Amino acid sequence: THLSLEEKIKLMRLVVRHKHELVDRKTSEFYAKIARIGYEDEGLAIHTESACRNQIISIMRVYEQRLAHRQPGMKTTPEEDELDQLCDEWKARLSELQQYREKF
């Protein structure tokens, strides 16, 4: 299914709010919780764990494309600025966990 921009922001706000609850190698518990709270509180459709995770993967993929093609002087909206900030914060959490796994 396809999320609207508003739904993408609601979803990423939740992901970031709960980011410290993600435990490396326990992704199932995290994405299941996000899917549940997104449905119960933010009015998102019922998603399976996998479907919810796929939505977040897609948001992040498009974010990376936006970053790569951003141009100096481009005009952005406040919704775009918030989504980019949320995506940056989620990317940083994933990178933190990757560094912990690799280095120790």
UniProtKB/Swiss-Prot annotation:
Disulfide-linked positions: none
Presence of keyword Membrane: no
Leader sequence segment: none
One biological process term in Gene Ontology: chromosome segregation
UniProt superkingdom: Eukaryota
Gene Ontology molecular function: DNA binding; DNA binding, bending; rDNA spacer replication fork barrier binding; sequence-specific DNA binding; sequence-specific double-stranded DNA binding
Subcellular localization, as worded in the UniProt entry: Nucleus
Keyword flag Disulfide bond: no
GO cellular component, one term: nucleus
UniProt keywords, alphabetically: Chromosome partition, DNA-binding, Nucleus, Phosphoprotein, Repeat
Binding partners and assembly: Homodimer.
Function: Binds to sequences required for mating-type switching. Makes a simultaneous contact with both the alpha and beta domains of the switch-activating site SAS1. Also binds to replication fork barrier 1 (RFB1) located within a 78 base pair sequence near the 3' end of the rRNA coding region. This leads to replication fork blockage. It binds the consensus sequence 5'-TA[AG]GCAGNTN[CT]AACG[AC]G-3'. Has a role in chromosome organization and integrity where it is involved in chromosome segregation. Has a role in sister chromatid cohesion and condensation.
Further details from the record: Present with 20000 molecules/cell in log phase SD medium.
Domain notes: The N-terminus may contain the DNA-binding domain. Last 40 residues of the C-terminus are required for chromosome segregation.
Protein name: Switch-activating protein 1
This protein's encoding gene: sap1
